[PDB]
Structure formats: C-alpha cells, structure tokens
Amino acid sequence: IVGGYTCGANTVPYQVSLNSGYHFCGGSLINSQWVVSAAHCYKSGIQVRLGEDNINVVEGNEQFISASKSIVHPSYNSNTLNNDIMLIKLKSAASLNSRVASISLPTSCASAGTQCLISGWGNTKSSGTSYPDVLKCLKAPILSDSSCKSAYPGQITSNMFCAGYLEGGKDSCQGDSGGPVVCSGKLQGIVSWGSGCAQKNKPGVYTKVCNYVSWIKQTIASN
Ligand SMILES: [Ca+2]
Numbered sequence: 001i002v003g004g005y006t007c008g009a010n011t012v013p014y015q016v017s018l019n020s021g022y023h024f025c026g027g028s029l030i031n032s033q034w035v036v037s038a039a040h041c042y043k044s045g046i047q048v049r050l051g052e053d054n055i056n057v058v059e060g061n062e063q064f065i066s067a068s069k070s071i072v073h074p075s076y077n078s079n080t081l082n083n084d085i086m087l088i089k090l091k092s093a094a095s096l097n098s099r100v101a102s103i104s105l106p107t108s109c110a111s112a113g114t115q116c117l118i119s120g121w122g123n124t125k126s127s128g129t130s131y132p133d134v135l136k137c138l139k140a141p142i143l144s145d146s147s148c149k150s151a152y153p154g155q156i157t158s159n160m161f162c163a164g165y166l167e168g169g170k171d172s173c174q175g176d177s178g179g180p181v182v183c184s185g186k187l188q189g190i191v192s193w194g195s196g197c198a199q200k201n202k203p204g205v206y207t208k209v210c211n212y213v214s215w216i217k218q219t220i221a222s223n
Helices: 146-150 209-221
Strands: 016-020 021-033 034-037 048-050 062-072 084-090 115-120 136-141 162-165 180-183 184-195 204-208
Touching: 016 204, 021 180, 021 184, 034 184, 034 209, 084 136, 084 209, 115 146, 115 162, 115 184, 136 209, 162 184
Parallel strands: none
Antiparallel strands: 016 021, 016 048, 021 034, 034 084, 048 062, 062 084, 115 136, 115 180, 162 204, 180 184, 184 204
16 A cells, blocks of 8 residues: 555454465455455465454464465456456354454445545555555545546456546555455455556556455355
8 A cells, every 4th residue: 555554453354464475465354254355366375364463473363264265256357357356265264353354245336436445565655665564544535437447548347446546646556456445334346456556647446346246145155
C-alpha cells in the first residue's frame, strides 16, 4: 500500500496472509474454512496465516492453517487477468473471534463514488521498494467505469473496476495482490493489477466480486 496508514493490530480481522515460506499475497476469510484471493496468486504449498499484524513476529493472535484445496476460476486468463479470483479451502476450520472474522459477500455491486478500505503488506513506495512488517490500510473511492476505461484503454472488462486517485500518490501495490477491498462492510474487490503503483492516471484495478457470488457459493457448497 502506497500512501496509506498503519491499520492497527487486528483491526482488519478478515485479512489473511498467504505464506509459502514468506508472505506473497493477501486474501480474505469468507467463512471459517474458505479464503478468497486472486488467481494470479496461485501456487502449491500455501499456508494461510490468520490474525496477523506483524508478519515477522509471533504476537499471540495468529492461526496458521495449511490449504487443502485451491480452485482457480474456470475462466481465469493470465494474459488479460480477466476473472482474477480463486478460492482456497483450509485443512481445518479457523477459530473465529473478534480478531479473526469472516467478511460478508455482497448482495449487490457497489457504485462509483462508494468509499472502500483496501489493506495489505505490499510495497509502500511508488519508486523503489520498501516492504512493511505490519498491515497498511487505504481508504479509496470506486471510480466510474468511464474513467477506468479511459485510464486503461482496451484492458478493462466487466469483471474489473478501478479504485483510487487519478492524481496518484495513493494505491495498492506489489504484495497486496489477492487482498480485500471492503465497502460498507462487504467484500467488493480483490487487489488484482495496475501499471506501476500510485502513478498519475493509473489507478488500481480490482476483481469485481459481485459478479462471482454464485460461483463462490456453489463451489463452497460442493467442496
Ligand atoms: Ca505475527
């Protein structure tokens, strides 16, 4: 997250870290046994880390649970990042409490102008690299589809939305991928892609979760 603020420990209780020996992507806990993330975060050997703030220090509220099954969206296209969403089943159910909690799926899509909370452990610089140990937060609005398509001609599908600031300076970034965009208490987006981080006229692009709720529910019901 570039241009954000330190969330505070366990104030984003649905945020997870995906770990394969190191943090590599975020995700969101959507019930006690399932996480949603970005398909471009797929790999084998995932351990899901819940209840994290500092990802390098054991602080006392963590739950570390390995994945038993990953399901990348059937129509994921790694060249265009269309349908950049996957589901991860945990080997055992998490213990839910005030600091480890699920986030609700949306019943409707959020409109442009809605303010959302984006969070993650990704790079905090637009030029260069600096990776934080603690969770960073950013409040940002959903942008109109016209402004999103004007920023990224030929690249925005119906399964994507833009959020952020056209002036630059505030954005998600590398390492935030897969993490949540929460608006009015619902998961509306997944950190997916962008050109660089926090550049002028290049806002973040997010998977539009409201388009996937039927697939998510059906998949969980059968796996
Ligand atoms: Ca920790």
